[PDB]
Design a protein around this ligand. Structure first.
Ligand SMILES: *[C@@H]1O[C@H](CO)[C@@H](O[C@@H]2O[C@H](CO)[C@@H](O)[C@H](O)[C@H]2NC(C)=O)[C@H](O)[C@H]1NC(C)=O
Ligand SMILES: *[C@@H]1O[C@H](CO)[C@@H](O)[C@H](O)[C@H]1NC(C)=O
Ligand SMILES: *[C@H]1[C@H]([NH3+])[C@@H](CO)[C@H](O)[C@H]1O
Length: 482
């Protein structure tokens, strides 16, 4: 058979970078797709397809990552050009990680199946980013290229910038025309399309374009696919945006034609670096999910892209399970007991907005019993996951904010919903559940000095301590006190 990069090669516009955590993009590719790093010992392993041209060995990831946390350290370039994506460095903007690097992604925030076989995408929270500033074979200057990505059309924000494609080698803004990358989100700072978003646009630096005009272009529709194929291409005073449901049907063209008639976009000044999840100046406020994508040399024909889209549809992307372990039912009322030795009589409770742990038993005040009792409801931002509503304060839910867990009233916003959704995971220490943040899947409910945080297994916050991490994120599900 033929994978996407075999199709691009047959069209004489071959891949020069080919990135996926889900599958091989060449029929003969059997090498490593990505690298994992686990928090227990900070060692790494690689994940390859199970067959040549096949699907990632998700079972090998699950084995490596058992009873710990995993990060995706490298997304390998399958093309042989060496264009592997690694932790993005500081640039015009600092990231939030060590020395202003951007965060690595969780390995488990984007479970899918491909024709019924589990695999994992790259779920990127704000501050997450990958890059290769030493890329070879990528288009530079006004040279032609194409690219595509398969993304989560429901995972996005309006912050700059969830990009995949060609960028600056310095990680700084070197001007109009020094980028050409896919963007997905509902930014309206520069361009935007019809409806409420999100939109596929093209980041050409100091502009996200939804078509020929700065700002609004009517022909760029809002994306309402869970899996979106975004296909972008650029050449000498020509470029295009095409989009599809990656699960069904064909690409439609939402822009095709001349460069925007504004200073600095023709000819282009591409530099050949590759970015994922961030802007070319390291703008790192965006979120999104990446499953697969490529960059090519040459300007692909519509026919070549249509063949690629037929291949994507035949890969049969379906949403995977985000939940493991004992889990919950909507309307259940629970208490959550600390399992860390020395703290095992404590329960997750709250004192006004502060979520904390306290000793709770049958002699406790009814006030504290209610503060240690939680109504489990369907996840506000994801219906597979859950949200935890206060018994004493109905309408208020556990949410993260500056990575501390707070009890705040639901204000009906997308942001609150996302900050208040948690995905049960079989407990890292085998005692009950661990509650993983849906929006920041590197982070978990974690008690630290008897206060609740959304903590990572190591990190820049004091409450990201690796000491006692597995125990401090494991809670037993008990009958509610009230
Ligand atoms: C991107 O879409 C989001 C989600 O619809 C918009 O969210 C609104 O944001 C404002 C404040 O920025 C809030 O007062 C509204 O309550 C939000 N709505 C929801 C449903 O969360 C956001 O405005 C959009 N961004 C742009 C730039 O248009
Ligand atoms: C690892 O986690 C699983 C799932 O909760 C559990 O069954 C097992 O007992 C755990 N092992 C250790 C060493 O914590
Ligand atoms: C430069 C601009 N701030 C962004 C929008 O065009 C781009 O991602 C940065 O590299």
């Amino acid at each position: 058979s033929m994978g996407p990069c075999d199709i691009y090669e047959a069209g004489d516009t071959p891949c020069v970078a080919a990135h996926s955590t889900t599958r091989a993009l060449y029929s003969s590719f059997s090498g490593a797709l990505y690298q994992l790093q686990r928090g227990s010992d900070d060692t790494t392993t690689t994940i390859s397809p199970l067959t040549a041209g096949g699907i990632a060995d998700a079972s090998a990831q699950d084995t490596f990552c058992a009873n710990t946390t995993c990060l995706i350290t490298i997304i390998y370039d399958q093309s042989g050009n060496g264009n592997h994506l690694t932790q993005a460095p500081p640039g015009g903007f600092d990231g939030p990680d060590t020395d202003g690097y951007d965060n690595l992604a969780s390995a488990i925030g984007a479970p899918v199946t491909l024709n019924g076989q589990k695999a994992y995408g790259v779920f990127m929270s704000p501050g997450t980013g990958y890059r290769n500033n030493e890329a070879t074979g990528t288009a530079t200057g006004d040279e032609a290229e194409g690219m595509y990505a398969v993304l989560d059309g429901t995972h996005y924000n309006d912050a700059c910038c969830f990009d995949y494609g060609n960028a600056e080698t310095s990680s700084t803004d070197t001007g109009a025309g020094h980028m050409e990358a896919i963007y997905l989100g509902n930014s309206t700072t520069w361009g935007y399309g019809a409806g409420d978003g999100p939109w596929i646009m093209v980041d050409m630096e100091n502009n996200l374009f939804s078509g020929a005009d700065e700002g609004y272009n009517s022909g760029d529709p809002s994306i309402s696919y869970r899996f979106v194929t975004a296909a972008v291409k650029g050449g000498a005073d020509k470029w295009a945006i095409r989009g599809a449901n990656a699960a069904s049907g064909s690409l439609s063209t939402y822009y095709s034609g001349a460069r925007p008639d504004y200073s600095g976009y023709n000819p282009m000044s591409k530099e050949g670096a590759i970015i994922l999840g961030i802007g070319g100046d390291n703008s790192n406020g965006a979120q999104g999910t990446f499953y697969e994508g490529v960059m090519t040399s040459g300007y692909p024909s519509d026919d070549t892209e249509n063949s690629v889209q037929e291949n994507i549809v035949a890969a049969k992307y379906v949403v995977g399970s985000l939940v493991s372990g004992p889990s919950f039912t909507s309307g259940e009322v629970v208490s959550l007991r600390v399992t860390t030795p020395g703290y095992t009589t404590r329960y997750i409770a709250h004192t006004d907005t502060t979520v904390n742990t306290q000793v709770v038993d049958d002699d406790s005040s009814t006030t504290l019993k209610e503060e240690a009792s939680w109504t489990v409801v369907t996840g506000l931002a994801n219906s597979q996951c859950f949200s935890f509503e206060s018994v004493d304060t109905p309408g208020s839910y556990i949410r993260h904010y500056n990575f501390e867990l707070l009890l705040n009233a639901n204000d009906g916003t997308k942001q609150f919903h996302e900050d208040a959704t948690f995905c049960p995971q079989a407990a890292l220490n085998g005692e009950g559940t661990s509650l993983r943040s849906w929006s920041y899947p590197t982070r978990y409910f974690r008690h630290y000095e008897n206060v609740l945080y959304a903590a990572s297994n190591g990190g820049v916050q004091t409450f990201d301590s690796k000491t006692s991490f597995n125990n401090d994120v494991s809670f037993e599900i008990e009958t509610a006190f009230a």
